[PDB]
């Protein structure tokens, strides 16, 4: 190369390089061999999966002693099973899922408590939230709710000093569109914990008393994973009355209703799980359910007031791109007739008019159009969710 000695070295080097090419051949064959071992372990473990069946899952009905456990198997017939000694009997105790064998009928192992796929859909959902207030200035009523639900659950210590009986639950009623469901999201927004937003139009089942038992499984789940606030949605059919001189649906609503009563207070008291119920029509529910002393606050949410309408526009105005206007405020205040859901819709529907014209901007003319349109549509269907005023 750069030394006359490096030139001599270079002729020798070729032979060292040659020796590596012969090793290369050997090396290819090893390369496949390194992969072949990973696949070996995988397949050997796979044979053990193939001879092994999909063993019966069960639950412990009653543990009499270590050697005799009664199980409710998922195939149907309840069995007497044994246990292996490589397990602690404390884990396996009743109300807990356990694995069962199918080769021998013995409890294989401990499985943690389990929840249905239905409960997963309900646990996932929450977003679309608002920061704190449904509507600003009304904020005092909102705080009261917060005071009821959040605090005792997180920290009981404050309630202990005072010596008082803690606040329990909230029942929400108000007109359709006011923002009852949004409040449910709102409390969730700030806190950021485990949530079960439980739709009650999927707890229901064709069999009777399976739906009641189900709701109960969700309450248990919320306790394990505290903090939790359970938002009950659409209880105009999971809460009702006795009924039952008709369909198979009618026996079913009364049963599901029984569960909501116990949880509110009838042997189980709200401290470990807290519930806010958002209801369309409060006269659907039970005369028992309403009764105060298993509910603390019964909050009535009011529709927008004159000054209350302005602040909501102010939050909407940030998302929307306009020419550099802020015109919405004055026009809404003189007019009348909005509920919370309609106010966000004047801003959404002005945005639609702009898009037809082609603008990324919303003009003062668009907004005007929306106010007339929304009022017009109310007139056709003034058949809103009946509450006497």
């Amino acid at each position: 190369m750069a030394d006359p000695r490096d030139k001599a070295l270079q002729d020798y080097r070729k032979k060292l390089l040659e020796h590596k090419e012969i090793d290369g051949r050997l090396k290819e064959l090893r390369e496949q061999l390194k992969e072949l071992t990973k696949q070996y372990e995988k397949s050997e473990n796979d044979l053990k999966a193939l001879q092994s069946v999909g063993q019966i899952v069960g639950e412990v009905l009653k543990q009499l002693t270590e050697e005799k456990f009664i199980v409710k198997a998922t195939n149907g017939p309840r069995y007497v099973v044994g246990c292996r000694r490589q397990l602690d009997k404390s884990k396996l105790k009743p109300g807990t899922r356990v694995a069962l064998d199918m080769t021998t009928l013995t409890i294989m192992r401990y499985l943690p408590r389990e929840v249905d796929p239905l409960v997963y859909n309900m646990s996932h959902e929450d977003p679309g939230n608002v920061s704190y207030s449904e509507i600003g200035g009304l904020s005092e009523q909102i705080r009261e709710l917060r005071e009821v639900i959040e605090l005792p659950l997180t920290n009981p210590e404050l309630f202990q000093r005072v010596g008082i009986i803690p606040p329990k639950g909230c029942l929400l009623y108000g007109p359709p569109g006011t923002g009852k469901t949004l409040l449910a999201r709102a409390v969730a927004s700030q806190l950021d914990c485990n949530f079960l937003k439980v739709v009650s139009s999927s707890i229901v089942d064709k069999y009777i008393g399976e739906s009641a038992r189900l709701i109960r499984e969700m309450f248990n789940y919320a306790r394990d994973h505290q903090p939790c606030i359970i938002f009950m949605d659409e209880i105009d059919a999971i809460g009702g009355r006795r009924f039952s001189e008709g369909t198979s649906a009618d026996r079913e609503i009364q049963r599901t209703l029984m569960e909501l009563l116990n949880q509110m207070d009838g042997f189980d008291t709200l401290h470990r799980v807290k519930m806010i119920m958002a209801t369309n029509r409060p006269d659907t529910l039970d005369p028992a359910l309403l009764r105060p002393g298993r509910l603390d606050r019964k909050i009535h949410i009011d529709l927008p007031n004159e000054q209350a309408r302005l602040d909501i526009l102010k939050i909407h105005a940030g998302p929307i791109t306009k020419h550099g206007e802020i015109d919405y405020e004055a026009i809404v205040k003189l007019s009348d007739g909005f509920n919370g859901a309609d106010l966000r819709n004047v801003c959404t529907e002005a945005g639609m008019f702009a898009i037809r014209a082609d603008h990324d901007f919303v003009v003062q003319e668009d907004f005007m159009k929306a106010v007339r349109k929304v009022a017009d549509s109310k007139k056709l269907e003034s058949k809103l969710d009946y509450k006497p005023v």
Binding site: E44, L47, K48, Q51
Partner: protein, 192 residues
């Protein structure tokens, strides 16, 4: 290589019977020339279940204990077949047919360790040793003694017991033409 996956060694009645039966089959050797064979059994467990054994033709001389024959080729080929039988059957270690261990056994152990992932040398005896265990299990250990001995490779004992499997246990009763005055279930048995 690891000798790890053992804290206990249980051995089936099958293991013993296979060695006496196999002696006739091979050559009618009869412990004239000691035999070493593969010890087969389970893995992925702390406890070692020796399910099975097969003989390998190994003759060790009685002129000399440093010379032996051990048929290597049989081991690789028998390997693929074990999976046809069950996928819990793999080579755990080796067996010595006794009457006793040797120093020579360390050398026999190094060859067998390449195949196994948990090699152990378990002496299953062709003669039953007393009314006690006819098996003793040992594992190769590097240790010093304060006797003024530097590093040795020797055999230190690990606890041996006799176990059984559900299929096998039933089969044993049927085969048996003894009734058992040594059952040890009750007062009558207990006094004996």
């Amino acid at each position: 290589m690891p000798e790890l996956a053992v804290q206990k060694v249980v051995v089936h009645p099958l293991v013993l019977l296979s060695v006496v039966d196999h002696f006739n089959r091979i050559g009618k050797v009869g412990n004239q020339k000691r035999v070493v064979g593969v010890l087969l059994g389970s893995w992925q467990k702390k406890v070692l279940d020796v399910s099975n054994s097969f003989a390998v033709p190994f003759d060790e001389d009685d002129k000399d204990d440093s010379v032996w024959f051990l048929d290597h080729d049989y081991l690789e080929n028998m390997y693929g077949m074990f999976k046809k039988v069950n996928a819990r059957e793999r080579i755990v270690g080796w067996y010595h047919t006794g009457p006793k261990l040797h120093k020579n056994d360390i050398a026999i152990n190094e060859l067998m360790k390449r195949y196994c992932p948990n090699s152990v040398l378990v002496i299953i005896d062709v003669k039953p040793k007393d009314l006690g265990l006819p098996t003793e299990a040992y594992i190769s250990v590097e240790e010093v003694h304060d006797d003024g001995t530097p590093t040795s490779k020797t055999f230190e004992h690990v606890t041996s017991e006799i176990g059984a499997e559900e299929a096998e246990e039933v089969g044993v009763e049927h085969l048996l033409r003894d009734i058992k005055d040594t059952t040890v279930g009750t007062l009558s048995q207990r006094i004996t």
